[PDB]
Ligand SMILES: [Zn+2]
Ligand SMILES: [Zn+2]
């Protein structure tokens with residue numbers, strides 16, 4: 364009955380309403396510490412994140428999963444400061460996203476396994492903060508290196524029970540390619556969330572993965588307007604999977620952040636202008652939309668509370 | 680002026696002494712030493728190895744090294760400061776961009792990169808107050824579009840601060856020529872620029888032409904000869920050749936060594952240490968005596984190892 368957060372271990376009952384795919388800052392390893400003035404200042408980024416997380420908490424959120432890896436510039440000290448000041452649980456990540464530096468991309472499957480295990484079992488850097496989830500990312504056709512990452516993630520998950528979350532580049536469906544590799548390693552689908560699955564209308568693809576026991580990440584809902592399908596279209600994929608009997612396979616989030624340096628310079632302003640609700644978009648907009656579409660409150664509670672707790676609880 | 684910034688603060692020109700102008704404590708990636716120190720055994724083991732290695736170089740006459748590790752090479756200025764203090768060897772730290780920029784760097788404009796370089800030179804690196812004393816840049820081939828931005832940002836930061844620029848030249852086809860054309864288009868004096876890894880080629884007429892234009896010529900990978908069948912002596916004879924051409928004042932010599940490396944295959948450090956057990960002491964223990972045996976006088980060797988680095992490192996607007 365324990366999940367590791369940036370403030371230490373918590374019990375399952377304390378997790379509450381969870382956003383399973385979020386970020387405080389999307390960056391690169393070392394970048395926030397080397398050039399904080401890219402974000403105005405570290406202090407300004409903290410203040411923005413604390414204000415935003417407090418608004419999410421007032422809307423009912425109790426935990427977020429920050430799926431920033433080392434190569435996404437995860438700064439666990441930043442996460443800890445924001446978590447404590449907003450009084451919202453934050454689960455930190457290990458793994459490898461789409462921008463590994465040489466010191467990561469030259470590593471073998473065995474070495475990557477050891478790195479993920481260090482971050483889960485011992486702690487991140489010198490902080491003692493342990494990761495509670497393993498993040499992986501692929502580009503449509505899984506590359507040799509990305510296959511090594513997925514295998515190491517499966518091996519680390521089998522050793523520790525922590526789950527795996529995935530990202531696929533270019534709005535492409537990658538769940539079937541990912542699931543093949545995970546299953547060749549003996550990983551249970553119930554440990555894996557196929558992220559950004561709301562980027563497709565292919566309900567056959569979604570239902571087939573859910574039927575195998577994968578978690579389906581419908582987690583970019585407010586990104587609809589940026590680059591196009593409406594956010595309501597994406598949200599109705601939640602209803603569609605409920606209607607086919609797969610409510611227990613659904614995880615919902617925003618994939619939001621309070622700063623971003625890994626893309627074009629004022630991309631944060633673009634995102635904020637399109638979705639001023641930020642991480643509160645799920646509770647303030649999506650949940651009432653599903654209720655008015657007739658989904659029972661208990662089912663919505665199961666998706667936002669029970670499913671994330673079952674996913675995060677380490678299970679061997 | 681009279682002062683150069685090191686990881687222990689400012690020093691005067693007269694304190695710089697015998698300098699290795701292209702070295703590394705550790706070749707890594709941003710954040711990596713902090714996230715996975717056990718790759719190197721431990722942080723403590725890496726420190727102990729680096730302190731021993733720098734004390735050995737000091738006993739061979741070295742007084743300063745320039746650590747040309749950028750952000751994206753995993754530069755850890757706290758590691759540099761610790762090693763510098765324990766070995767009593769001055770270390771000059773770098774800003775700039777090498778060949779592995781992450782997205783947060785490679786998505787930036789020339790103006791943004793200029794501001795990043797300026798913050799590392801004028802304000803400090805991270806939250807340490809340690810200021811960079813050189814700007815490092817790297818190119819491949821004919822210079823890629825992103826690399827050209829970096830070179831232009833480096834020229835702008837040099838022009839605003841007086842600190843010099845040192846380059847990693849990859850490729851065998853006279854890559855210094857396109858670097859020079861970019862630097863000159865920005866208004867940068869060649870005397871602020873070291874075209875590095877120039878010993879990778881035997882093309883003496885190319886090196887002489889750059890030296891005659893006022894560029895410093897970095898003959899700085901001498902011990903990498905054996906790991907391409909040129910020996911280290913053949914590389915070292917380029918030093919003699921440029922002296923005989925009349926360009927002693929344009930030469931900078933170094934090892935391009937390190938005490939840990941994670942940016943290539945796992946135990947590459949063991950391969951390197953087996954080929955060159957002298958480490959950073961290879962230049963003073965092997966190259967300087969070799970040149971003396973070939974008849975280069977003491978005063979000329981001191982000009983290359985002491986005078987030229989001081990003139991290069993001294994911030995000169997001009
Ligand atoms: Zn993602
Ligand atoms: Zn994300």
Ligand SMILES: [Zn+2]
Nearest residue numbers: 846847848876
């Ligand atoms: Zn180099």
Ligand SMILES: [Zn+2]
Nearest residue numbers: 702703747935
């Ligand atoms: Zn180098």
